[PDB]
Amino acid sequence: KPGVFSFLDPLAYEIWMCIVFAYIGVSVVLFLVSRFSPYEWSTNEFGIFNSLWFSLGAFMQQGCDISPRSLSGRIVGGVWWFFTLIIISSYTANLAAFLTVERMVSTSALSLSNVAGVFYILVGGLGLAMLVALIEFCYKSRAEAKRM
Amino acid sequence: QKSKPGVFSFLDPLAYEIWMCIVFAYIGVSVVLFLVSRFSPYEWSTNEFGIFNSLWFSLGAFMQQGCDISPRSLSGRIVGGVWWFFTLIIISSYTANLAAFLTVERMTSALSLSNVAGVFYILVGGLGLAMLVALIEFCYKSRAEAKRM
Amino acid sequence: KPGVFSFLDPLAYEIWMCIVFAYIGVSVVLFLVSRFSPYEWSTNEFGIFNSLWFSLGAFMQQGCDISPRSLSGRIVGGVWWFFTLIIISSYTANLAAFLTVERMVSTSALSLSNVAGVFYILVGGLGLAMLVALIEFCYKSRAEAKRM
Amino acid sequence: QKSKPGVFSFLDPLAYEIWMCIVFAYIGVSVVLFLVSRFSPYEWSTNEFGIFNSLWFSLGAFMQQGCDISPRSLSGRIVGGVWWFFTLIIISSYTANLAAFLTVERMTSALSLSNVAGVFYILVGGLGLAMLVALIEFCYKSRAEAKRM
Amino acid sequence: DRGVQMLLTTVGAFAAFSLMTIAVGTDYWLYSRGVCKTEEVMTHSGLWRTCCLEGNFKGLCKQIDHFPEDADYEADTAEYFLRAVRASSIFPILSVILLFMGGLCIAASEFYKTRHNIILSAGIFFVSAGLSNIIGIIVYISANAGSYSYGWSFYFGALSFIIAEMVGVLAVHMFIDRHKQLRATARA
Amino acid sequence: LFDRGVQMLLTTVGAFAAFSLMTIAVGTDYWLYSRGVCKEEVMTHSGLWRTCCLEGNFKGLCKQIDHFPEDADYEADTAEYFLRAVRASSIFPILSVILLFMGGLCIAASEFYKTRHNIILSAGIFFVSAGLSNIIGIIVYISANAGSYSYGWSFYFGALSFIIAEMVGVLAVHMFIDRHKQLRATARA
Amino acid sequence: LFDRGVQMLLTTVGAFAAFSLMTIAVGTDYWLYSRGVCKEEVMTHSGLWRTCCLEGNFKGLCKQIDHFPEDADYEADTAEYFLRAVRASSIFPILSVILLFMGGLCIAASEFYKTRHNIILSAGIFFVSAGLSNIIGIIVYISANAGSYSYGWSFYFGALSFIIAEMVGVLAVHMFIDRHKQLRATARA
Amino acid sequence: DRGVQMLLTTVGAFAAFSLMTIAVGTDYWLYSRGVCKTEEVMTHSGLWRTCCLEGNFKGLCKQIDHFPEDADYEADTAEYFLRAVRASSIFPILSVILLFMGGLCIAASEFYKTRHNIILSAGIFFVSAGLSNIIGIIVYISANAGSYSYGWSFYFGALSFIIAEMVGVLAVHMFIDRHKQLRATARA
């Protein structure tokens, strides 16, 4: 009986924790090197909110809408891209090794039990986004009612 | 003895339930993104995420392409991020399971055309369907233009 | 002694020929369903030359700049994306199977002799592009003299 | 016995010569794209493919992350296409060889931080380098601004 | 059109609610051979009880037990949580309830034309019902994993999800038009 | 790409070349070179309907392709049987050449009734459909054969006929765009 | 995110909390819970400098960590020796502590001579550098450990110190832009 | 300054040409253990000769045989073509020729200021030189594949490629600047 979060098996928990830490650090450094200097004020669409979005899209290998234009921002983006490529390839290779070793011991297709955790996370994220949007809409509607 | 590969044997690495749930999750993600992008009039549209555009965005995200747009709201970005994580895990699982199936024979050579004939058939069918839809739209517009005058 | 073009080993020659044929057909169908309608004129930058570019970028999983907006064009793009994903995953999986079976045969790292063919193809493409650009430059230079 | 993985053991799947040639081919492709994009005055710029932007485009193409720009000329598109094919083959080979290394042990557990510590070190070093460059730019502009007034 | 949009929304909501109510209540969810009145005989199982088919004791239905404690095994708490979630059918029932409340909101939208938030609430309920249906399908399949076929009752819930999501799109589109119409009138 | 008279002539000659190549491909028994029996195992050249002997004891004795062999054929599934029927009947190459002939007739008929601009669009649609049909036929035949071999010139005659059909169809729709552009251009003036 | 006085107080309290957490983590020998000796095999809680016994026959006895053990250590390459030296000295946790202290000193002295706007930028640089140093220290410590085991509260004390430092550093740079915006606002008028 | 950039590009072209000519000339390309003047001894080999190192027969260089016909084997024609390409060192030498042509074009630019098309020619020559250098490196490594370490001579060729590509980039800058200045002058 595979675990619910059995899709995190190829990498260790320490790797995931360090991945989250590295993502946070890269996002903060990108925001800093994007908007700290008054002499660049901005001309770049890289705030703290947009920096985290760019880093997430880079890790998921889905370039969303923007790319850094300054030298430091591009350095951050390049090192993050290299890290992401290595980590994703490592995950895929280790999962393939796990599956091949399980297949070669003395049904065959992947079952929904092996990826049920990713579905749970996806639906939880959909619900969280719905709740956030509803709260924002309620706050904006209340603000308009008070003003009017 | 090894049997002749099936026409639609490219779906073998993932179970049928996984593919069905993939289609369903794609539909749900598209609907939720369209909902959270355009329901609030206080965001009006500033974004371009209609139902058609949301479906296109989710399809592009699943195939790891991305069309031309990205959510800008916090809720839309949460939806996009969870969908991206889902897509990454699912595609990696498919590739890993196909590698495991090709490495170990149960009861290595180059993949033959019989291994991907199903995907080729689906591609040609999609081309024909697109041609039919475009011709239908052209015929509908041509008669409508003549009706006006 | 591995072949120069041994990176095509995981797939068959029939698959490569059919991939080229399918690319041509999809590009032609995209151009057809993009510009044949006089009532869409255009609002889309999908010509015959641009359709080939979009299809080539889709096959290598590198969306370049544009995406179809018409329903038929989006159908073409979706089926091409599904075909591309399946084919690329099949290539990666068969290459992994080849390497794993070779490893369990009774140095380890991939040598440059395995990817020498892709390096040669890349440099040949660079040279062809440079030659085409020089030809275009000379043709425009001659054309301006004729006008004057 | 299985030795403790090296700090930079994440480069093991591809040989050192392959990595060196990858770096050099990236440089060459960036230069060729910049040349074919901006050399002709008849193209003047209409495109945004400077040397820095061409380097960014090639780096993004190799990591399969995309870019905000794309070549529009025939020669630039040929360069982009051959670079994309090269990138696809190289990344697939890296993933396949890493899978082969993780499947067969010569003389399976979850990957540990020791296996990927080097990529983390490189990431943090790049972050520090970026901070240093940004601080240097700010200091240079602060002194230059004071010189004007 | 506004009237046609309302008609389509009501028809789709009613169809989705009926399909889910039939699917949850009916027992044609899975075709699997199994024991009876607890020999091997082909049966069809739903969410509560499995009815033995084409056998010597055909017709009789045995209540499905989601906690096979014959061996007195616990393993990990995740398995117990999944078994408890699947046994109650909390997610299909929640989807049915959300569909019912969305239908109530749609019906009450006609009485109060000024209050446009009821249409948005109906759309939100429909989308949440679809998500609950998705979670229920995932949980059901995972519990079944921990030859076989899926009957028409299972596909009734699958088709209800597609219909419920389609109606949710229609409702939010109708909410979008209502606010745009209000803004258009204020422009004049 | 330029003018209209040369474009019409180039498209017409391309359509004629594609039609001739596809007709030759359908009617020539040189599609695959493989070992087999043309009546022991020996090198033979095969086609769509018959396979003749090659460099054997009795060279040139053609025998019809065993599409439904007897003596415990082991049967197959519905999809495999459908594929076998499609390969035997050669429905897709025949449909491709039929579409090519229809498009050529439309192009020849385009000289008359020049006001009817939809004729050239119909010819382009026919040629694109013929190219897709050629793709399907090539894939089906290769899959059927795949279960040391090489293909003959007629197989590459059909392969080139698909490319010529699409290249002709590409610039045939260019006329439909330009013909509509002419009406738009003359409307403003 | 709003106003200036509340932002200043929030940044100061966050910096102080991060400094306290990281200092406690450095000075507390509860980093890893693993079996081992503290003088047979028994459960022990480890830290950066000493490891004490847990539920053993002689509890409350700490022993210095064998960073360079004798008795045929077998040696290693330069990289492993460098990692061992870094882990033994725990320079990166100490470097993070020092950088956090400098950032706190700068942000506290920012009240005096408020005209100097570059002090807050220096505080932000100090805090982000301390966060990066914490990242390197955590990575080094985990890699040394991996060469059952669970991490102690002090290790997670330093895990939150890095998170707080970056979130404090984010706000530290944010008020730097706001101050320049005020200067830009008053320059136009 | 444009003159400063021209001086920089001339210095870079000279440095790259010197590096590449030394790399082709000297024989410290690869350190490996091999036979001497047909026992195992560590030797160094370039493109033409292998010379013994710290051995009894140290100092004598033996010409490399690129055609191992000891057993009279041919196998495929691709191997023979690769061996022939490596044997002549056609790509490193033709890269040397391309760098020489680029340097000549740069030097002759001061004679004709009006003719801007030859600075672009110099940039084209430098870029083609780098491409040919990378092809030569790939061919050399592939042929060597079918313990070892690369020497400074090999790294001089790698360093020459980087400078030539760097000089080619800045050479094209002049051609862009020459046309930009010309167009600006013609505007007024």
Side-chain angles (χ1 to χ4, degrees), chain A residues 2-50 52-106 108-146, chain B residues 1-136 138-142 144-147, chain C residues 2-68 70-106 108-146, chain D residues 1-104 106-136 138-142 144-147, chain E residues 1-186 188, chain F residues 1-187 189, chain G residues 1-187 189, chain H residues 1-186 188:
Chain A
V4 156
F5 295 148
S6 39
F7 67 102
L8 308 159
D9 267 31
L11 309 182
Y13 152 83
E14 298 133 74
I15 292 195
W16 295 113
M17 164 180 216
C18 282
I19 276 165
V20 170
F21 280 32
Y23 163 84
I24 285 160
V26 163
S27 295
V28 172
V29 165
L30 186 53
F31 148 74
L32 197 186
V33 307
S34 282
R35 302 212 140 143
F36 88 105
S37 161
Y39 308 119
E40 335 298 305
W41 271 84
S42 101
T43 195
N44 56 82
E45 209 166 302
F46 274 97
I48 175 61
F49 187 40
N50 263 0
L52 301 143
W53 186 234
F54 176 82
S55 305
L56 198 73
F59 184 78
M60 310 289 177
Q61 303 226 113
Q62 306 244 18
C64 45
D65 43 287
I66 54 184
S67 83
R69 293 205 131 282
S70 82
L71 182 59
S72 52
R74 292 212 162 145
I75 288 163
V76 172
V79 295
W80 186 237
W81 285 351
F82 188 62
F83 174 94
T84 285
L85 181 73
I86 294 304
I87 291 303
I88 297 315
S89 287
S90 303
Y91 173 83
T92 311
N94 218 20
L95 185 57
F98 279 29
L99 295 181
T100 308
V101 164
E102 299 336 320
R103 196 171 151 91
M104 67 173 30
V105 300
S106 50
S108 52
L110 275 191
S111 67
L112 188 55
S113 298
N114 294 115
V115 288
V118 88
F119 282 89
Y120 295 153
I121 283 169
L122 170 74
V123 179
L126 289 181
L128 174 83
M130 258 182 132
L131 169 75
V132 161
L134 278 194
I135 287 165
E136 286 310 319
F137 165 71
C138 290
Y139 192 94
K140 290 179 162 34
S141 318
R142 290 339 176 222
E144 289 333 285
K146 298 324 221 302
Chain B
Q1 81 294 338
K2 176 199 222 63
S3 48
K4 311 206 181 234
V7 177
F8 302 106
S9 48
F10 63 98
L11 309 156
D12 278 8
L14 302 182
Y16 151 96
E17 302 91 274
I18 289 192
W19 292 111
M20 209 186 33
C21 292
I22 277 165
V23 165
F24 291 160
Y26 155 75
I27 287 164
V29 155
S30 296
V31 174
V32 170
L33 181 67
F34 154 71
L35 176 123
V36 305
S37 291
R38 291 214 156 161
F39 86 104
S40 172
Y42 316 115
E43 319 300 294
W44 278 77
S45 194
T46 44
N47 53 82
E48 253 212 299
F49 278 100
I51 188 60
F52 200 31
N53 274 358
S54 300
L55 288 153
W56 195 229
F57 176 85
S58 292
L59 188 68
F62 190 79
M63 319 283 201
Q64 278 146 339
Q65 306 267 357
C67 45
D68 34 22
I69 58 200
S70 192
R72 193 153 263 310
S73 55
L74 176 56
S75 47
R77 280 178 175 187
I78 288 161
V79 166
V82 293
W83 187 235
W84 292 347
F85 192 66
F86 174 93
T87 290
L88 180 82
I89 296 307
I90 289 302
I91 298 311
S92 285
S93 296
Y94 178 84
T95 311
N97 213 47
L98 187 51
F101 177 77
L102 296 168
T103 310
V104 183
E105 190 161 45
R106 285 226 274 230
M107 215 81 264
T108 49
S109 55
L111 278 200
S112 173
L113 187 44
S114 306
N115 292 96
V116 293
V119 85
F120 276 96
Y121 295 147
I122 289 167
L123 174 60
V124 182
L127 293 187
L129 168 65
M131 254 173 312
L132 158 85
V133 163
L135 275 189
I136 278 176
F138 163 73
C139 274
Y140 172 75
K141 295 179 110 32
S142 300
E145 172 140 306
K147 190 222 51 73
Chain C
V4 156
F5 302 115
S6 45
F7 65 99
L8 309 157
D9 273 359
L11 307 186
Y13 159 84
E14 322 257 26
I15 300 200
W16 293 114
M17 161 192 339
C18 285
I19 277 162
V20 167
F21 289 1
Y23 165 81
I24 285 160
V26 165
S27 298
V28 172
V29 165
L30 194 57
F31 152 73
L32 187 88
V33 306
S34 286
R35 319 265 262 211
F36 96 105
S37 163
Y39 307 106
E40 314 308 312
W41 270 76
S42 98
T43 197
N44 59 84
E45 223 186 348
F46 272 100
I48 175 60
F49 179 49
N50 257 358
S51 300
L52 294 147
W53 187 232
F54 172 81
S55 304
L56 198 75
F59 184 81
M60 326 264 183
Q61 315 228 293
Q62 305 244 18
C64 45
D65 41 293
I66 52 182
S67 294
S70 164
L71 167 70
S72 61
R74 292 211 163 150
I75 289 164
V76 168
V79 292
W80 187 238
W81 287 352
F82 188 62
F83 172 93
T84 284
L85 178 76
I86 292 304
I87 290 301
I88 298 316
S89 293
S90 308
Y91 178 87
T92 312
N94 216 31
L95 186 55
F98 278 30
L99 298 178
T100 304
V101 158
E102 174 212 317
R103 201 167 156 85
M104 48 193 245
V105 153
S106 49
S108 48
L110 269 190
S111 62
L112 186 65
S113 75
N114 307 117
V115 294
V118 86
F119 274 95
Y120 296 149
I121 287 168
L122 170 75
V123 181
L126 294 185
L128 160 65
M130 283 187 332
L131 163 74
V132 152
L134 289 169
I135 280 160
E136 166 253 304
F137 173 65
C138 295
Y139 162 85
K140 272 147 179 282
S141 319
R142 176 237 269 184
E144 295 284 272
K146 197 79 92 224
Chain D
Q1 96 289 306
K2 162 78 37 73
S3 193
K4 164 174 209 283
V7 171
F8 300 108
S9 47
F10 62 96
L11 308 155
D12 291 7
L14 301 182
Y16 160 90
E17 293 98 344
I18 286 192
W19 293 113
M20 143 198 281
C21 291
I22 278 166
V23 166
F24 291 162
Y26 154 77
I27 283 165
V29 159
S30 295
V31 175
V32 166
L33 181 64
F34 151 71
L35 195 142
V36 304
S37 292
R38 284 226 182 142
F39 87 104
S40 173
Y42 307 109
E43 320 300 295
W44 277 76
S45 193
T46 46
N47 50 81
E48 250 205 328
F49 278 99
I51 173 63
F52 197 26
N53 273 0
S54 297
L55 285 151
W56 191 234
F57 178 85
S58 293
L59 186 69
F62 187 78
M63 320 279 207
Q64 281 148 339
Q65 296 272 12
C67 203
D68 41 6
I69 61 200
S70 166
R72 284 153 101 241
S73 56
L74 176 58
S75 52
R77 280 177 178 187
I78 287 161
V79 165
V82 294
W83 187 236
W84 292 348
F85 189 58
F86 175 94
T87 290
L88 181 120
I89 294 308
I90 289 301
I91 300 310
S92 285
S93 296
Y94 178 87
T95 314
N97 214 49
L98 186 52
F101 180 80
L102 295 166
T103 312
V104 186
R106 279 175 150 195
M107 212 51 270
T108 55
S109 57
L111 274 200
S112 69
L113 190 56
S114 318
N115 302 73
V116 298
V119 86
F120 279 94
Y121 293 142
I122 292 166
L123 178 62
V124 179
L127 292 191
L129 170 66
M131 305 201 18
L132 160 78
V133 167
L135 278 190
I136 278 178
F138 169 74
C139 273
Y140 171 78
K141 296 178 113 34
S142 301
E145 168 145 307
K147 193 223 54 75
Chain E
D1 188 82
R2 165 52 162 66
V4 201
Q5 271 149 46
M6 203 84 36
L7 182 80
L8 230 61
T9 278
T10 58
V11 165
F14 169 63
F17 178 78
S18 313
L19 285 158
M20 260 304 255
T21 314
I22 286 164
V24 177
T26 318
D27 304 314
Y28 276 62
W29 272 60
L30 186 89
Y31 283 129
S32 53
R33 52 209 293 95
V35 280
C36 206
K37 30 167 91 145
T38 69
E39 279 273 357
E40 247 200 298
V41 54
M42 166 93 150
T43 88
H44 55 271
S45 41
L47 292 176
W48 334 103
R49 35 84 173 261
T50 164
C51 301
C52 312
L53 203 49
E54 61 74 65
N56 175 49
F57 302 121
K58 171 259 181 272
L60 168 91
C61 304
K62 207 279 303 312
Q63 277 283 315
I64 274 153
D65 48 316
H66 307 100
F67 299 104
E69 315 194 346
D70 36 36
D72 206 334
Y73 80 106
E74 178 84 73
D76 175 9
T77 174
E79 286 311 305
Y80 167 62
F81 190 78
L82 170 68
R83 274 181 255 166
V85 152
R86 158 76 176 90
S88 37
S89 286
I90 168 175
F91 288 110
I93 283 162
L94 199 74
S95 174
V96 172
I97 289 164
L98 290 163
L99 264 172
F100 165 78
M101 317 195 27
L104 287 177
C105 283
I106 281 301
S109 76
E110 285 154 348
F111 290 146
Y112 312 94
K113 93 171 49 193
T114 77
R115 264 271 88 180
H116 312 299
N117 270 16
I118 317 151
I119 271 285
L120 173 61
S121 310
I124 292 279
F125 280 137
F126 288 140
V127 181
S128 304
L131 294 191
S132 303
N133 200 328
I134 277 305
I135 288 291
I137 289 170
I138 295 270
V139 162
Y140 169 76
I141 296 173
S142 294
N144 279 11
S147 172
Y148 70 105
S149 327
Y150 294 113
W152 56 269
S153 292
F154 173 78
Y155 290 110
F156 266 22
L159 181 88
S160 156
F161 158 81
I162 297 161
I163 293 180
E165 290 300 321
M166 268 162 33
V167 173
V169 175
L170 261 160
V172 190
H173 165 61
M174 281 164 55
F175 185 72
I176 275 154
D177 282 336
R178 280 161 178 232
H179 266 271
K180 282 213 303 266
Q181 279 154 17
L182 197 94
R183 286 187 334 163
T185 312
Chain F
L1 89 164
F2 194 82
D3 213 14
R4 208 186 248 116
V6 50
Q7 265 191 219
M8 230 69 210
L9 245 293
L10 160 75
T11 280
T12 324
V13 302
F16 184 83
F19 178 80
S20 293
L21 286 181
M22 198 80 190
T23 300
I24 289 326
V26 152
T28 283
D29 38 45
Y30 292 84
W31 272 58
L32 174 89
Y33 285 19
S34 68
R35 308 284 286 196
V37 51
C38 72
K39 211 176 49 166
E40 221 151 325
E41 308 252 10
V42 85
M43 186 51 113
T44 61
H45 67 82
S46 192
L48 273 187
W49 328 93
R50 310 100 38 81
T51 136
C52 283
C53 317
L54 212 41
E55 85 156 47
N57 287 338
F58 30 90
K59 305 176 40 134
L61 175 275
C62 247
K63 156 207 126 52
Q64 258 79 20
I65 302 195
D66 259 5
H67 296 134
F68 296 89
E70 267 96 343
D71 203 29
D73 211 28
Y74 314 128
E75 222 69 36
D77 211 282
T78 54
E80 217 287 293
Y81 171 68
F82 171 96
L83 220 268
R84 287 186 278 138
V86 165
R87 162 72 184 88
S89 56
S90 324
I91 178 74
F92 282 111
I94 291 166
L95 163 76
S96 169
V97 47
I98 285 165
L99 288 152
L100 281 168
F101 181 65
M102 204 37 257
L105 268 185
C106 277
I107 279 185
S110 85
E111 305 326 289
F112 314 139
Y113 313 126
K114 202 58 86 177
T115 291
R116 273 320 293 184
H117 293 164
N118 275 29
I119 306 188
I120 296 131
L121 175 58
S122 92
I125 300 307
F126 276 137
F127 284 142
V128 167
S129 306
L132 281 204
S133 172
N134 200 352
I135 282 181
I136 310 157
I138 278 184
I139 284 166
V140 151
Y141 156 100
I142 292 165
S143 299
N145 269 14
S148 265
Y149 51 79
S150 266
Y151 297 108
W153 47 278
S154 149
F155 179 81
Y156 294 125
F157 266 28
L160 266 193
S161 160
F162 146 78
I163 286 166
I164 299 182
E166 299 276 26
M167 268 47 251
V168 157
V170 152
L171 96 100
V173 188
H174 267 321
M175 337 201 180
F176 188 76
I177 287 155
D178 275 34
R179 257 154 191 77
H180 267 267
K181 278 201 167 131
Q182 182 251 338
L183 254 55
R184 224 91 59 78
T186 194
Chain G
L1 86 164
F2 192 85
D3 215 18
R4 214 182 255 104
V6 46
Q7 273 182 224
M8 191 48 221
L9 175 129
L10 198 61
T11 319
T12 312
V13 300
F16 175 74
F19 170 86
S20 297
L21 286 175
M22 183 102 204
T23 298
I24 287 306
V26 152
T28 288
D29 43 53
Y30 287 87
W31 281 58
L32 171 89
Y33 288 15
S34 75
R35 302 277 278 190
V37 307
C38 34
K39 209 167 46 168
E40 247 290 278
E41 300 250 9
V42 86
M43 183 77 148
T44 83
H45 64 80
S46 191
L48 277 186
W49 324 108
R50 70 209 37 249
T51 93
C52 262
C53 319
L54 206 71
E55 62 102 43
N57 53 307
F58 52 108
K59 287 176 70 178
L61 182 45
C62 270
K63 140 185 200 324
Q64 300 223 299
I65 300 200
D66 271 359
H67 290 135
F68 289 84
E70 270 102 340
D71 277 31
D73 206 26
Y74 310 123
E75 224 68 31
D77 211 282
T78 56
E80 173 67 273
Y81 163 69
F82 183 104
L83 187 100
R84 271 150 20 183
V86 166
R87 162 77 187 84
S89 65
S90 319
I91 164 175
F92 281 111
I94 292 169
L95 184 61
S96 189
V97 151
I98 265 66
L99 286 172
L100 279 162
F101 185 72
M102 313 274 88
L105 261 192
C106 284
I107 198 65
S110 212
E111 314 216 66
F112 284 0
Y113 329 114
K114 272 148 65 170
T115 78
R116 272 308 266 133
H117 297 347
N118 274 31
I119 313 185
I120 306 127
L121 178 60
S122 90
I125 300 321
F126 274 144
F127 290 147
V128 301
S129 310
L132 291 188
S133 172
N134 212 346
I135 270 170
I136 313 154
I138 281 153
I139 289 190
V140 149
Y141 172 77
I142 299 187
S143 298
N145 262 8
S148 300
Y149 66 100
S150 211
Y151 299 109
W153 52 277
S154 127
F155 177 88
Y156 290 130
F157 257 32
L160 203 35
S161 158
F162 147 79
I163 279 160
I164 284 160
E166 302 274 22
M167 272 42 180
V168 162
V170 152
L171 297 180
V173 187
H174 193 309
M175 47 185 39
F176 182 75
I177 324 175
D178 269 31
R179 257 155 197 81
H180 268 89
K181 280 203 164 132
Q182 188 261 336
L183 195 44
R184 215 79 54 79
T186 188
Chain H
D1 169 50
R2 143 85 174 282
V4 153
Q5 296 144 32
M6 171 40 102
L7 167 134
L8 245 175
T9 203
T10 312
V11 164
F14 162 69
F17 175 78
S18 312
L19 285 154
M20 182 81 267
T21 35
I22 266 50
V24 160
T26 88
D27 284 323
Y28 285 37
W29 272 56
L30 181 84
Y31 282 107
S32 77
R33 273 185 86 130
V35 79
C36 214
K37 64 215 214 190
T38 65
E39 272 272 358
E40 251 194 303
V41 49
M42 209 273 269
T43 68
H44 63 233
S45 39
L47 291 171
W48 328 101
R49 317 131 47 199
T50 314
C51 314
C52 261
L53 215 36
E54 40 89 25
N56 170 52
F57 301 116
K58 181 216 126 314
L60 197 52
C61 300
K62 185 245 298 208
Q63 295 243 321
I64 272 154
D65 52 312
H66 309 105
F67 307 101
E69 318 198 348
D70 39 41
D72 211 335
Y73 91 104
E74 185 88 77
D76 41 350
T77 176
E79 279 304 310
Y80 163 64
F81 229 86
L82 160 72
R83 275 180 253 168
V85 163
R86 207 265 172 221
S88 41
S89 285
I90 173 153
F91 285 110
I93 292 165
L94 164 154
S95 165
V96 169
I97 299 155
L98 288 170
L99 275 94
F100 183 75
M101 297 300 305
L104 163 154
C105 283
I106 292 265
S109 78
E110 288 147 349
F111 199 21
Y112 313 98
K113 271 69 151 144
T114 77
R115 266 269 83 176
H116 308 300
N117 269 15
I118 63 129
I119 274 288
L120 171 69
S121 310
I124 274 294
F125 277 130
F126 289 138
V127 168
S128 328
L131 290 192
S132 281
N133 205 220
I134 205 77
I135 283 295
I137 279 171
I138 289 151
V139 163
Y140 160 81
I141 297 175
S142 293
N144 276 15
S147 140
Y148 57 78
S149 209
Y150 300 110
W152 57 267
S153 294
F154 177 79
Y155 283 116
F156 271 28
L159 217 167
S160 155
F161 161 84
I162 302 159
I163 292 184
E165 292 301 321
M166 255 177 144
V167 162
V169 157
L170 155 81
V172 176
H173 266 70
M174 281 138 213
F175 188 67
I176 285 151
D177 278 11
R178 280 163 172 233
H179 266 87
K180 281 221 307 266
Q181 275 154 10
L182 198 88
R183 288 197 336 159
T185 311

